[PDB]
Target: Glyoxalase family protein
Amino acid sequence: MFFKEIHHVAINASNYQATKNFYVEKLGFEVLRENHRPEKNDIKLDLKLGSQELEIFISDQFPARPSYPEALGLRHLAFKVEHIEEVIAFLNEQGIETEPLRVDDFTGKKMTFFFDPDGLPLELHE
Amino acid sequence: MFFKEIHHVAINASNYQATKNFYVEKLGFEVLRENHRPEKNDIKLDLKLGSQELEIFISDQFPARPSYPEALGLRHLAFKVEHIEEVIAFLNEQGIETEPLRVDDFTGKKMTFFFDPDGLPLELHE
Model:
């Protein structure tokens, strides 16, 4: 059982104000810590919602997330929701677009995607 | 509280046997589902450990994970451990190399990284 528990997921983002507007203001993560790493040269923003932790490294040095084809490594992060329509409505009201609703090919449960300011796919799944 | 709970994290991997050897056999994830998507053309492997779910898309179409610099998007996945030395020993015994142990710059807790077969950074953090 060494690998049963996630400490955090880390994300690379391009712009500080975009990151606060999206993750903190809209998604409702709270700031745990914020520190500027002069050497690196970035901002490290740790965010908490519930027992979940999200670590965001912010820098204009990162090129675009590969697509068509996507690259090896982490692809997307999915959130479990109780009733997907209300979450979609909430996001749309905040100016966050969502893909049309569909069902999972192998499970039959509702799902869709929205995207962070740098185009990171974020899934909603019932 | 819409975004408080992770349904899963998705990973792109290059090789099927490498993926089973690493995630299932060594890390101890169990197979939840496995399906071949002819259209796509990949294998979708869903894995479960505890309440955690990991979705792995396996295909030789994905190019290398960007580094130097890393790209925008998901960067790494971190596991919470109780006593890091034993987890490191376990990994090393399974032929999985770990970076030298250090402490987190802002928290003082022990951490290190190991890497999946395609070079995805995976963190251990106390």
User: Anything to note?
Assistant: The domain at 8-126 of chain A is CATH 3.10.180.10 (2,3-Dihydroxybiphenyl 1,2-Dioxygenase; domain 1). The two ends of chain A are 26 Å apart (CA to CA).
